[PDB]
Symmetry: C2
Subunit: 271 residues, 2 copies
């Protein structure tokens, strides 16, 4: 299983992670869909970035193959603590961070609580500001296992559905039913789900204080997180750029891979 990488104790949690490349460190933070893992989200991103940077992609506690501590208390602050624990564990003093949706919200929160540890940020279809729960997100977080449910979820993420094959739906369905996966997932964002969007968000006041050069990326047709959310982040973050891909859903790193990789690498190269 290529989704399983190396293991390291971080913030007291046995964490699964990938580490490829050398030089300036870049932390990639995955999303929060069912069966999600750092590898699943960034497999097409790591190879490109690792040619110029040291890429670290860990499975956040409660997701992927990282340990799911009994009676663990999941929260924005706990996840931020996990990220910092991972950086501490790897002696990563300061790094750029790329966050996908859920991970984007965590990226913002980490930059606010540990400004000295974060350099540049890339927020992709990111959480971080309050927006009304969409039908797509409620369907994603409300997922129950079945190949048809997974095919439909994948369709929600994609603009070009031809990319959603029976095989992909089957593989992700299988990933979603691994021991303990659906159990922790279903209890992670229970109804009413608007509560979690609000909890993962940072205040406009706090976001305005961010000094980090930031690159906001979004897919015009994103059905999970509305484009309006990134437009708002773009009005709040001072040193920011916004790049919106037309004919692209939530999966920007997957549907516009080459354009995404080029933009991100050049963005970091500026430093």
């Amino acid at each position: 299983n290529l989704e399983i990488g190396k293991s390291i104790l971080a913030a007291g949690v046995l964490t699964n992670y990938h580490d490829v490349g050398e030089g300036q460190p870049v932390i990639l933070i995955h999303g929060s869909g069912p069966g999600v893992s750092a590898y699943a989200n960034w497999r097409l991103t790591i190879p490109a970035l690792s040619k110029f940077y040291r890429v670290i992609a860990p499975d956040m506690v409660g997701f992927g193959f990282t340990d799911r501590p009994e009676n663990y208390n999941y929260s924005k602050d706990s996840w931020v603590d996990h990220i910092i624990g991972i950086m501490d564990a790897l002696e990563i003093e300061k790094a750029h961070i790329v966050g996908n949706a859920f991970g984007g919200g965590l990226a913002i929160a980490t930059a606010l609580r540990y400004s000295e540890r974060v350099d540049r940020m890339v927020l992709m279809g990111a959480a971080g500001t309050r927006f009304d729960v969409t039908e797509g997100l409620n369907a994603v977080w409300g997922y129950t296992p079945s190949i048809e449910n997974m095919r439909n979820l994948l369709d929600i993420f994609a603009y070009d559905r031809s990319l959603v094959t029976d095989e992909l739906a089957r593989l992700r369905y299988e990933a979603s039913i691994q021991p303990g996966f659906q159990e922790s997932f279903s209890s992670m964002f229970p109804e009413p789900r608007q509560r979690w969007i609000d909890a993962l968000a940072s205040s406009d006041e706090d976001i305005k204080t961010l000094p980090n050069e930031t690159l906001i990326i979004h897919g015009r047709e994103d059905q999970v997180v509305p484009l309006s959310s990134s437009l708002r982040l773009g009005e709040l973050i001072d040193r920011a750029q916004l790049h919106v891909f037309g004919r692209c859903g939530h999966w920007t790193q997957i549907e516009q891979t080459d354009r995404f990789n080029r933009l991100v690498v050049e963005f970091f190269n500026e430093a």
Copy 2:
């Protein structure tokens, strides 16, 4: 005067233009401010693009050093005819087009009337859709000569005013008072100026038919053309990408030169 380049008869008008580089042709269309010329707008853009493309930057009839025909009838269609006349004159069968504001509106109009002659487009703080005249635009089009008026206009275009020096204001003021310049300029967009924004615009219906890969660029703080205008173009053009620079005014090619040049060259390189 480096703003004066070569001369060629196009659509019956003696046209001043610059031609640098080899390979795939790219036409750069300047804006409509006082004293504007292809060189003034694109001097920092041509050198970068000319390393990979043949860059053509002409002075549109009624602007720069191109002839200003007596009793000439200026209009969106006449300007489109000038662009096509320039391409015909240079045996440019198909080319990418980069349009700045006014020029962006012309780029869209040319792509609609001569789809076969236009490949990829880059619309920067472009006209093309209807928007309520801004105080900045009315001040620009309502310019009367003086170094103080020019300094203020330059400030309207810029985010970082430290870039507006007495010397630059002096040089552009001098450019604006060249024989016949202010005369044709003041009669070009007379009050009420909303009429000209509407005339230069293309209908939502027509814009939706554009098949061209398009790159829309805008400065968050643009005081002349509102960001909302580009957001709208981005909702209308199918194969489009939107890139918004924070801490950037109307002068994107001038204030974010390297980022702008890289994005444009890579955009064209995809073809």
